[PDB]
Every structure is written in structure tokens, then in C-alpha cells.
Amino acid sequence: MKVRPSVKPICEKCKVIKRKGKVMVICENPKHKQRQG
Amino acid sequence: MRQTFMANESNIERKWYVIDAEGQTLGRLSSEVASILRGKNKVTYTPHVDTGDYVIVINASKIEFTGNKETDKVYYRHSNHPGGIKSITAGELRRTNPERLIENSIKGMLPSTRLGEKQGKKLFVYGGAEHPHAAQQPENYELR
Amino acid sequence: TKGILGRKIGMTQVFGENGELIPVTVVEAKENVVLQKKTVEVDGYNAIQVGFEDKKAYKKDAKSNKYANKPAEGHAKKADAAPKRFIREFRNVDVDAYEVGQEVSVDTFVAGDVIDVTGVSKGKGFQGAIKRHGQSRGPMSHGSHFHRAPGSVGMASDASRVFKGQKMPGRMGGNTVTVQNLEVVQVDTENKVILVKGNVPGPKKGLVEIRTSIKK
Amino acid sequence: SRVGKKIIDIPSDVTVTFDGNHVTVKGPKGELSRTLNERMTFKQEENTIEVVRPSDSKEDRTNHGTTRALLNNMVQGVSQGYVKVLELVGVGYRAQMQGKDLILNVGYSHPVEIKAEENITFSVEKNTVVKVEGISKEQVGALASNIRSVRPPEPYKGKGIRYQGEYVRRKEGKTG
RNA sequence: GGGAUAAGUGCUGAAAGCAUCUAAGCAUGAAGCCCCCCUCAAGAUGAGAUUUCCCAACUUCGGUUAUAAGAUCCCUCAAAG
RNA sequence: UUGGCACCUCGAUGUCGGCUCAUCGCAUCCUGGGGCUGUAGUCGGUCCCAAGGGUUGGGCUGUUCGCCCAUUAAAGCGGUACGCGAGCUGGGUUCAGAACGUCGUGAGACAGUUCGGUCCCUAUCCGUCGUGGGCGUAGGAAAUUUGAGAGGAGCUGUCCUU
Ligand SMILES: [Mg+2]
Ligand SMILES: [Mg+2]
Ligand SMILES: [Mg+2]
Ligand SMILES: [Mg+2]
Ligand SMILES: [Mg+2]
Ligand SMILES: [Mg+2]
Ligand SMILES: [Mg+2]
Ligand SMILES: [Mg+2]
Ligand SMILES: [Mg+2]
Ligand SMILES: [Mg+2]
């Protein structure tokens, strides 16, 4: 999980979602998992 | 010419009311009850004497909050021991001690004076629909 | 779950089955009687009240606690028993297994039972921080004028006070203490004594309460 | 909400009955009851049901979609049921039935027991293919998730418990 | 050991025909939180509860009285100080 | 932290280090729970949650630091008048003596050095630790008690088996 203020797609398969009030990126590639913070 | 009536213990008549917390918002019920307890609805209101009425609150366990207060309104207290902060959420308190929840909300709206304490002592809160004060013959009171 | 009251007699030792030396406390637990039976219906909780160690009967001009007063005599005669020196409740037992008036013999416990023992620890009187709280001394030499003092009691302007819980000189001992997970080494029904493994709080002749250990 | 607008087909053998918000569906395999959103109306046709939302607000659209989906899931669960299939990978990784419960031996020093739940049936094939069958799609998914979480697939050899169709990313464990 | 959680892990699931741990709903998840364990504790003035004991005369008939049960003074003491 | 400012205190707010006693924050050193890994395993890296508890003896130096020896699960970082001198010490440092180098014609001087060199106070109030008396608790008493609250505790190694 990448926790950082700048959450955004890294590849075309990254998907920006919002869970529990937090912007996140979910992807088939586990390296690209992000959570805003 | 001085002519203002002053209530005193010889001419004060305190009634008993019952108020149903079910489906009511905590703070709004609380402000109204505080008015009743202080006697602010009486035309003989006299600041230096207790002209208020007794209130029984039933169904305290059915009081409701708006927003996310159930998990986000936190009651803190301190035991006067170093590091002695203890907290409880409003929802948890409603589950485990609704009487205290209502009591504390109402008593936070009464002055921190000797008379204020006395007036707050006229409040009776019960989580269920029954109260043990049929002897006092209380009347139902409709909010607002 | 079981319970009984006795007097601390003293310590001694027994040789175990492999010759291991077992220090033991001898507890004399004669004259235990169920005086009262408390229930959720009447009292709000279940418990048996046990009276231990008969005292003498009421007499007109009694001057000591050796003779029961009239309230105590009435309470005991309700159970049909002689008045008792010590009375304690056991909530850990099953009330339905007891009758008021019933004897509680040392035989309720068996060798191997793991038990909690509760007593009042020996009194020490007014004691200082080293003894009472196990604090460190200051230097005994090198110019020191600090040997047995308790040390700094706060900080400075913040907080301009001493916090509750500061450890200071004062009365030591005489406190309720429970030692958990002791063991019943032996029961001697002829002498009404229980040999408990290890040591228990309190002076000799002191009241001790033995219960089935809460942890298991 | 297209899902909300979409109508639910009821097989002739399946009966849906509403009690205010609460609904219950009976069918050949079992009965499923739950409480739906109180603000959704239901047009109960003889052979089909339709969900209707009061407004076009965000909340109403979300709840309309989810309500339709949940009710259709109940109907299809009573009619055909739901099944989830997991498989075991790894030499010595086996499963078996201890009556109704399922005991798994997956590389641990102890077997792991999973106790069956109401309305759910476990079935082991070839000692390496577990399948959970039920009427509740949600229950089936939950229990399959628990089984699989007993030991999920590791990337270096695929060993562990996986859903039979699951794709497991693979890694080259050892390099010079 | 129990309950509720954190970061997480998911199930079911639409908004957004797909997807999605989340919006509704259902799980799981820390030496941490609330308990469980130990001690103090009803001046908890909201002063709680149970068992037992005592229970009359005189009165301006409001009330009083010494006595009761009980507890002390004083004295012999220690396991207490 | 080094500073800037000069707003409280010069009819005095004791100054370094140590000792005694702690207390709080979390930006976490260990232990507990996780995600990612250029994570095969054993180890690691990085990030997230987490402050319950734990977080060592010595050599040198006044020292704080720092280096070193030997340990440990780990040897955390900070605040509290760089916590704490009406609780202790007094080795450093800025009184009087003396001396070296240096500067100065000199008297003398030097965030240069060296040897020596007085640390007072019977606790009034709050505060804190113990321990009694009064009255209250709608009769007067003896015991047994519920538990609203509060405090305590909370750490971890190694080995065997699998
Ligand atoms: Mg970036
Ligand atoms: Mg020492
Ligand atoms: Mg001395
Ligand atoms: Mg002055
Ligand atoms: Mg943190
Ligand atoms: Mg200072
Ligand atoms: Mg300081
Ligand atoms: Mg000082
Ligand atoms: Mg000196
Ligand atoms: Mg010269």
C-alpha cells in the first residue's frame, strides 16, 4: 500500500475509487495500490 | 414605585410532568426539559427561588442523534489522576447508561449554582417506559 | 467451587512423594456453619454467609467481643448455630448445594485442589518510601544529605502541584491480599486442618479465607 | 438505475410475499427472508415483480439498484441455488468431511475444522476440490471466503486454497 | 478468555447494465479500547441492600424523660499502633 | 537546535552534569496487527495501525554528547523553568590565593590553561501520603454486603516437539 497525499493512476489499469471517505487506487498490479494520506 | 411580585416557598406550586424521549432529538428535548426544571414557563418565575416543576423522562434508551454522533460524539472525563482520561462514545453510553446520557445532557444546560444543582435534582430519567412515581400523579407533557 | 474460613496456625514442611520439600501453611478451619443464604430474589445476588469459630453466648454485662450481643445471637439462632467470631460471604459457591445451618468441614477440599487464599497482611505501622515503596536510597557517603528521603515529588511551575498517586511515607500493611493458585497439600479431618502449599498473608491466628481458585 | 428498473422474473414454483418492507421468498430449495429498503415500492405481477423508486435522488437510485439486485438474488437462490468451488494446490494439501463439518490439512501442524452453517452444504471431490452449496449467495460467498482464507494462494508455487477459476499471480522466487 | 474496534482482509452490492470491501447490509481483524484478574469504594448528600436486636412512662398531650439494644470512660493487653 | 526581538522578573525567577522520584507526547527502539517488496526459505527493506508494558552493566571524560568493552527482545526520540538544589550532590562554570603560555610600559587581562576554594531555612496555605473526630444519610443499634466510580496489573528470552 502506498500512503501519500498524491494518489493517482500509475498505469491504465489503475482505478480511482473512494472508500470510507478516502481516495484510493486499486489495480491488478499490487504495487499500484494507493491510499490518500 | 417597587411593585414586582417575588415568589417564595409559601406560594410556589411544583407539578410533576412526564416526557417521552422516544423519537426525540437529545439536545432539543434537553433544552426544553431544562426550561421546565428552571420554571421558565411560569409567569411567577423568580430567579432566586426554585419555581420549576418535576420532570420524569421515560424511554431514554430510545433517544436519537443526528449525523454520526453515535460513534463520533465522545464524552471525556478525568479521574484527577495523571493520565486519567476516560472516554465513552454517545452511542455506547446510550446502550449502557441512557439515564446518565439524558441526565448529563440536561444538566449541562442548567447553571452551575446551588439553585441549579437543586433544580437538576428534580429530574428523573428512565430507559424504559415505566417510572416508579405514580404516587406523584404526573401529567403527560407534549414538547414544543 | 468451594470456600471455607480458618485461622493461620503457622508454617511447617512436608516431604512429598519424591522427597521434595514442600513448605506448607497450617490452617485450622473448625466450626464453619452456613449462617445465611443470600439470593437474587431477596438480596440481589447469590452467596452463602459462613460463620467461623464459635464464641460464647450472650450475657448481661458483657465487656468484650468474646460474648455475642443480642443482634448477633438472633442472627445465628436463626441458622440454629452458636454465635461465630468471623462471618464472611462466598459468592463463588453454588447456593443450591447448601442449607442454612449446614456444617462446612475441611473435607470439602481435597488434596490437589488449586485455591485462592485471602487474608489481611501483617501490619508494619508508619513506614518510609524505601521500605513501604521499595525506593532507592541516596548515596550513603560522598557528601550526600539524602539517604532515605522519597525524592522529587513533582516538577516545577508546570504543574505547580503534586499528582495523586505520589508514593510517600505512611501506614504499611494491614491490607486485604489474595494469593492465587496455591494448592491444598493435605486435609486432616481429625484435627480440622488444611495444609496449603506455600505461604499466605497475615499474622499467626489471623483469619484466612480459602476459595477454589478463580482462574482455571 | 437500469438494474433497479429491470424486472425480476419469478419461476412458477417460486412464491414471493411481502409484509411491508419485509419480504420472504419460498421455492424448491428453501426459504429466504429479509427486510428491503422501506422507501421502495413493489409492483407484484402474477409472474414477475418490479421495484419502483419514489424519486431520482442519489440515495433513491442507489437503493433502487441494490434492492432490485438483492431481491433477484433471493429469487434465483431459492430457484437454482448458488455454489462456490475452491481447489487445493500443494502436495499433501487435502480436505475431507467429518460428517457435516469440513476438515482441511494444508501444510499446518494441525488440521483446520470449518463447522457447517445452516442452509449450507460442503462437498469434497478428489480430496482437493471443495464446493459450498446454498440458497444464500451472500452466505455461500462468506463461507467460501473463510475456507479460502484458511490458507490463501502463495505466489511462488500457487500452493494453498483458491477459487477454482481464480487467477493467481506467479513470481520467480529464486534468482542468483 | 469475551465484546467492540484500528490499520487491513474480504462477502454481498448498487450509484455507474460492467467494475467496485461501501452507499444500505453482513463478516473478520492488534500487546491497544471495554471487560475478565487484584485492591479501595454508598459523604455514590443519588448517602443503596440483606439479616438480626431494642420498643415505656410521663406529658403544657406539639413534647419530654432517663433508660433499652448497643457503645464507651477506666483498666489488663497485641496479631494493631 | 543556533539565532532574532527585548514583552514578565535586577527591594534576586539559583546556573551545567549527576543522584532520587517521576509524569506526558508519538514523529515507535522491542514486543502485537497489517499492505508492498527487486518477499523462494531463514533473514531483510519500506510504509500503515498501535503509547499496554518493557527499553542493560562497565572503561574514558565534570561532563551532556561521543567512542569503546560486554550484553539485550530492545538498548527509542522529545516535553515537563534544557522536569526535579525550601529533595541530595557540587566534579565544570564567572569571587577573593597562586602559577604557565599569551597580550600589555604598567596596574592588569584571556568563552586559554593549571592547583585550591563556606550550598541557609523549625512548612502558614494550596498540593500529596497516611490517620482520627463531627454531623449527615427521618427511630436507636450489631454484623454481612451491592458496586456508581477509582486505583493496580499489563514486559519478555531460550529450549523441545511439529
Ligand atoms: Mg508522487
Ligand atoms: Mg544506588
Ligand atoms: Mg549522614
Ligand atoms: Mg520581592
Ligand atoms: Mg502513530
Ligand atoms: Mg530555569
Ligand atoms: Mg532543568
Ligand atoms: Mg525547588
Ligand atoms: Mg568546584
Ligand atoms: Mg611583556
Ligand SMILES: [Zn+2]
Ligand atoms: Zn496500475
